[PDB]
Ligand binder design. Structure first.
Ligand code: ODN
Ligand code: ODN
Lengths: 301, 301
């Protein structure tokens, strides 16, 4: 028994976090080999943020206007460029703590860990999901901008996220490590509203599989259903449609539990139409959608 | 906005995790300076666990019967002793990655991060609370025994927990780093049932303060109450009694929000007697008790 939202161990990323200052603005950067990555709005004043012309603003910056601090060591900047919405600062020292790594752009619904940092210093780690509307429900006060999200496979860190903005709703928007935003958001202080935040159906089903593996079976019901009939119900409840790809990703969990995916869909259906009547699943009074099928296999096999 | 259960960055502890084998039993150990700490039941066979005589079982073990592996480096054991329920293995090398650290014994209700490990390898990090019945609702399959729980203050790791057992209920029991169990549990495969798992009232109140800080105010009601009158209600709902010490620990949150502790207690009361009628607080459909007052200050000031 025992199922926890778990984040990845953060040590490999802790060794890459640095502080980046340009003028009076400071935020977090990511130091890998001899490049530091950070949000380009590090070059903006609070007044620039309303309508930045990043090209024009960057023209007025030289290598020596970028202060990069790694602990107490200060790094010498020998070059700078803009890639989409990320600033790349070339430094004269390769990070000795650079882990094996790749830059990946994740899909909505996939999960990752964020190492929340302030002024280059790691403060906390938590697990979250890329919401279907490409927002992240983070924990970030002023100063965590530039914090990164990642997954770890064996000894390789896949960086998938860099926090750039807090929207007026308080939710977060960011980019991949090539500087391309997830979703329609931009690095400007302007009206930016996110679409409907739907529930990640394939993740909810994975979590129901984890509940069964852990002894929570009360919601296991006696009906089955069809993919079209289920999506009919899912659409009404602002759940993402389930595809056959999702059914196939759930394959290993159906095999471990002997519960067919459509049977699980019919129990989910009943839960969406009836509620939980005051009972809990895995200690939660709502359906949880920040576990992917792989996360469940990771923690339940 | 934004409030997440956050764990501490784990890197300082990742550098201390090792694998400890005695005969055919392997588990996680903690390498600090030139001592490795691990559950003494590493010396037990599956059959020894029903009624171990640890003194007699340890007599039959020499330094060379303890295999300690740190990554691919194997450490030379030059001594061994038993301290309560923890085995201490003296090795000939001080861990170069030893962080500043202390051993502390925490109170029920306090929180800490667990770095779940398997065979010496970090696999995940999560935040939890010492339950008032001295259990931990962990995520630990066979092999995570010896995983440790910790808090970090600046650059100092306070180790407070070592996972030793899974009880028949699936919940976890462990020791502090001096080898003394939290609660009445013992390192033996026998009937062991935990007491009532009450809710940590002072933590629930801290979390309600975090909700107010984050804009969730619907539960803020118009009543007040008294400490005796509140504990009357808390006892009925298997909530821990609130003391004046708890009121004083909540002092900074009452000051930040302008909401008197007894006012918050009266809103909690109303929630315990009425439920939440289907609405949520900070995205949760139940009251959350794994945030201490300090955790909330950490993430909300
Ligand atoms: C790093 C982000 C952040 O903290 C910002 C923005 O969302 C983004 C860059 C600029 C930051 C602000 C504007 O809104 C923020 O949410 C906010 O935290 C910052 C304040 C505190 C308002 C100061 C100005 C700055 O431009
Ligand atoms: C490390 C713990 C663990 O995994 C144990 C016990 O709770 C404790 C030491 C011994 C382990 C067992 C007995 O119960 C466990 O929960 C279980 O995981 C172990 C099995 C798999 C049953 C094998 C025997 C061993 O003694």
């Amino acid at each position: 028994s025992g199922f926890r939202k778990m984040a990845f161990p953060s040590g490999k990323v802790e060794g890459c976090m640095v502080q980046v200052t340009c003028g009076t603005t400071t935020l977090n950067g990511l130091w890998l080999d001899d490049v530091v990555y950070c949000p380009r709005h590090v070059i903006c004043t609070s007044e620039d943020m309303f309508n930045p012309n990043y090209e024009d603003l960057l023209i007025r910056k030289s290598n020596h206007n970028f202060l990069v601090q790694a602990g107490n060591v200060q790094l010498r900047v020998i070059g700078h460029s803009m890639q989409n919405c990320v600033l790349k600062l070339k430094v004269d020292t390769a990070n000795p703590k650079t882990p094996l790594y790749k830059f990946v752009r994740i899909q909505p619904g996939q999960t990752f860990s964020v190492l929340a940092c302030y002024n280059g210093s790691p403060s906390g780690v938590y697990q979250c999901a890329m919401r279907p509307n490409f927002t992240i429900k983070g924990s970030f006060l002023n100063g965590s901008c530039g914090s990164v999200g990642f997954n770890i496979d064996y000894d390789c860190v896949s960086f998938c996220y860099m926090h750039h903005m807090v929207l007026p709703t308080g939710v977060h928007a960011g980019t991949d490590l090539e500087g391309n935003f997830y979703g329609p958001f931009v690095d400007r202080q302007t009206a930016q509203a996110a679409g409907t935040d739907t529930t990640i159906t394939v993740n909810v089903l994975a979590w129901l599989y984890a509940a069964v593996i852990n002894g929570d079976r009360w919601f296991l019901n006696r009906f089955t259903t069809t993919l079209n009939d289920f999506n009919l119900v899912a659409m009404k409840y602002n759940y993402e449609p389930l595809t056959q790809d999702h059914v196939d990703i759930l394959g290993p969990l159906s095999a471990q539990t002997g519960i067919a995916v459509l049977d699980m869909c019919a129990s989910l259906k009943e839960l969406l139409q009836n509620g939980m009547n005051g009972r809990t699943i895995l200690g939660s009074a709502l359906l949880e959608d920040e576990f992917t099928p792989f996360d469940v296999v990771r923690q339940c096999s």
